[PDB]
């Protein structure tokens, strides 16, 4: 969903599950910005499909089932199923979800008399009496350790994980990720710079959190988003100077496992599937 990227699903959305600017422009110029996805994809095929943008090339790596919402409005949250495109030969690039997966998106909760502070914010996602009922997820990154130089599944969150071998804390590196088995009231709870630092404070805005978080997000339709381990995370709010993210979208490859995404994920998922059968 950058300016241009080659690889798309059969619905012409990018590897991050978001629409391409170039395709959005093409649809706008033809006066089909607010048409259904089916009608926009009919028109894209009229413009020669993956060659629809004359000045660069696209290539379909994934089959995905999405909603009928206008291309411009499509998000990872609109994906329901993800697999390799039947007619694409070779290894797929990195994709927001694991192959042969089903996706569930969190519905925003309705509440007559909304609670104050974090309780109102978290109850917009999960029906919990307290924050204690939320279960923090196990986000694992297959990466090399700064200390012992072993490459293993290090467990933690989006930003940091711990080496099982030597116990050294490592910043999350590029490589295969997983959110493991999705628990009930699944949350990611991380240190909040905006809460802790004396310049901002724990009554900071939603905007202020993202400004000070040090995490890479883009303000886009569906809100600011972080993709990790076969989930797409949205920011709920802060409780006790800790930022709470929820898997607004979560993949399921079987047994409620969020599966593996990133370098080598196809091999790792195939190996994982043979365990989950048992
Ligand atoms: Zn294009
Ligand atoms: Zn280590
Ligand atoms: Zn905060």
Curated annotation (Swiss-Prot):
Region annotated C2HC sits at: 192-238
Residues annotated as binding Zn(2+) 2: 145, 148, 163, 166
The entry marks the following residues as binding Zn(2+) 3, namely 192, 195, 204, 238
Q: Where is this region: C4?
A: 145-166
Q: Which residues form the CoV Nsp2 N-terminal domain?
A: 5-278
Q: Binding residues for Zn(2+) 1, per the UniProt record?
A: 22, 53, 56, 58
Outcome recorded upon mutating residue 264 to V: Significant loss of GIGYF2-mediated mRNA repression
Where's it found, cell-wise? Host cytoplasm; Host endosome
Q: Where is this region: C2H2?
A: 22-58
Task: Report the function annotation for this chain.
Answer: Enhances mRNA repression of the 4EHP-GYF2 complex in the host, thereby inhibiting the antiviral response and facilitating SARS-CoV-2 replication. Possibly acts in cooperation with nsp1, which induces ribosome stalling on host mRNA, triggering mRNA repression by the host 4EHP-GYF2 complex which is enhanced by nsp2.
Description of how the protein assembles with itself and partners = Interacts with host PHB and PHB2.
Any idea what this protein is called?
Answer: Non-structural protein 2
Write down the species. Severe acute respiratory syndrome coronavirus 2 (2019-nCoV)
Of the parent protein, the shown chain spans 181 to 456 of 4405
């Amino acid at each position: 969903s950058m300016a241009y990227t080659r690889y798309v699903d059969n619905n012409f959305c990018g590897p991050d599950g978001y629409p391409l600017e170039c395709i959005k422009d093409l649809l706008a110029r033809a006066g089909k910005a607010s048409c259904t996805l089916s009608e926009q994809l009919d028109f894209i095929d009229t413009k020669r499909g993956v060659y629809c943008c004359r000045e660069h090339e696209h290539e379909i790596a994934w089959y995905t089932e999405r909603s009928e919402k206008s291309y411009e409005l499509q998000t990872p949250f609109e994906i329901k199923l993800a697999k390799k495109f039947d007619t694409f030969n070779g290894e797929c690039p990195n994709f927001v979800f694991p192959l042969n997966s089903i996706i569930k998106t969190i519905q925003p909760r309705v509440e007559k008399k909304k609670l104050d502070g974090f309780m109102g914010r978290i109850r917009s996602v999960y029906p919990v009496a307290s924050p204690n009922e939320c279960n923090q997820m196990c986000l694992s990154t297959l990466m090399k350790c700064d200390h012992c130089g072993e490459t293993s599944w290090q467990t933690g969150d989006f930003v940091k994980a711990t080496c099982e071998f030597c116990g050294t804390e490592n910043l999350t590196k590029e490589g295969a990720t997983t959110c493991g088995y999705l628990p009930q009231n699944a949350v990611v709870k991380i240190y909040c710079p905006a809460c802790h630092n004396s310049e901002v404070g724990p009554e900071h805005s939603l905007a202020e959190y993202h400004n000070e978080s040090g995490l890479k997000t883009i303000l886009r339709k569906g809100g600011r988003t972080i993709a990790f381990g076969g989930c797409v995370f949205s920011y709920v709010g802060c409780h006790n100077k800790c930022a709470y993210w929820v898997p607004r979208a979560s993949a399921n490859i079987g047994c409620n496992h969020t599966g593996v995404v990133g370098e080598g994920s196809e091999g790792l998922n195939d190996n994982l599937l043979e365990i989950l059968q048992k």
